[PDB]
Amino acid sequence: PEALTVAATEVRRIRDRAIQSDAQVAPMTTAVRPPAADLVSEKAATFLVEYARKYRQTIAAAAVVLEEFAHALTTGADKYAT
Amino acid sequence: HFEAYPPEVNSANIYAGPGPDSMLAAARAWRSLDVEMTAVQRSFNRTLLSLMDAWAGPVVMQLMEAAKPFVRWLTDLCVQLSEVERQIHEIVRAYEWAHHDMVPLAQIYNNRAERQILIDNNALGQFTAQIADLDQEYDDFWDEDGEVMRDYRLRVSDALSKLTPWKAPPPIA
Numbered sequence: 001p002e003a004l005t006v007a008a009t010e011v012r013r014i015r016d017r018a019i020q021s022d023a024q025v026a027p028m029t030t031a032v033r034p035p036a037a038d039l040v041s042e043k044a045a046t047f048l049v050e051y052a053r054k055y056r057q058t059i060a061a062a063a064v065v066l067e068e069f070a071h072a073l074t075t076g077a078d079k080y081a082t
Numbered sequence: 083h084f085e086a087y088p089p090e091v092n093s094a095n096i097y098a099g100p101g102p103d104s105m106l107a108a109a110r111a112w113r114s115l116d117v118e119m120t121a122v123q124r125s126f127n128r129t130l131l132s133l134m135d136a137w138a139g140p141v142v143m144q145l146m147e148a149a150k151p152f153v154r155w156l157t158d159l160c161v162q163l164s165e166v167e168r169q170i171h172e173i174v175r176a177y178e179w180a181h182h183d184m185v186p187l188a189q190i191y192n193n194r195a196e197r198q199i200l201i202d203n204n205a206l207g208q209f210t211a212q213i214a215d216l217d218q219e220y221d222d223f224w225d226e227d228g229e230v231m232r233d234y235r236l237r238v239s240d241a242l243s244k245l246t247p248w249k250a251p252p253p254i255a
Contacts, residue, residue, distance in 0.1 A: 001137075002137075003133055003136040003137040003142075004133070004137070004141075004142075006133075006136075007129060007132075007133040010125070010129045010132075011126075011129060013125075014122055014125050014126055014129070017118070017121075017122055017125075018118075018119065018122050021114070021115060021118035021119065021122075022115070024114075025111035025112075025114060025115055028107050028108050028110070028111035029108050029111045029112060029115075031104065031108075032104050032105055032108045033099075033100055033104040033105075034099055035099045035100065035101055035102040035104070035105060035174070035177045036095060036096045036097070036098060036099035036177065036180075036181070037094075037095040037096075037098035037099055038084075038092070038095040038096055038180075038231070038234075039084075040180075040231065040234050040235045040238050041099060041177060043238070044105075044173050044177075044238050044241075044242065045104075045105075047242050047245075048105070048108060048170065048173075051166075051245055051248075052108075054247070054248050055248055057248075058159075058248040058249070058250065058251070061250050061251050062159075062251045065152060065251050065252070065253055065254055065255075066254075068253065068254065068255045069145075069149070069152075069254040069255060071255075072145070072254070072255050073145070076141055076145070080141055
């Protein structure tokens with residue numbers, strides 16, 4: 001029972017670290033500029049920005065999965081103690 | 083495609099930008115992201131193990147089984163992250179080569195200038211062969227810028243095709 005509450009906290013810590021690292025470099029990954037004025041450079045930049053945006057959505061989804069898991073760890077501890 | 087543009091345009095465009103510093107900064111960012119998420123992966127596995135040996139029960143083993151797809155997904159994610167910096171470097175390299183190989187604007191202008199001068203003094207037709215030489219050189223400039231831009235597009239498209247679309251994580255609950 002105690003171990004489940006401990007596990008829930010470690011999971012939430014992991015969630016926070018994943019969200020923090022994502023937020024920390026987002027200003028760099030989503031701000032890629034075309035190195036030149038040509039169409040190829042612009043398409044590369046556009047792709048890399050969209051790729052970064054899609055990664056952030058992926059991490060946010062992972063954050064949700066982790067939080068649900070911690071909630072199950074917390075509910076599991078309280079439910080299986082009564 | 084870019085072969086429809088005169089070399090004046092293709093050369094000017096490749097020289098105009100801010101350069102690749104923005105892309106290189108992004109590359110350093112993706113690397114750190116890769117490092118952090120690798121540590122996140124380790125911590126998630128240490129937690130599951132630390133939960134197992136501390137209180138081994140039917141409830142815990144169920145949760146351990148439910149998380150197996152997610153640790154699997156995490157591995158795939160980390161692999162995919164370590165791929166990004168390498169492909170950005172490939173794109174930067176492609177740009178650098180295009181920039182280096184494009185016909186300098188000075189050479190194009192000097193050609194057109196020299197050609198006009200010969201034409202201005204060709205009433206007697208003594209410069210016709212040389213004017214032909216300059217038109218040939220300009221045509222070569224045109225085709226060369228076209229080829230450089232073609233290879234650039236091909237190299238960038240190749241690099242982008244290695245960047246797999248991100249997959250949504252499986253639930254643990």
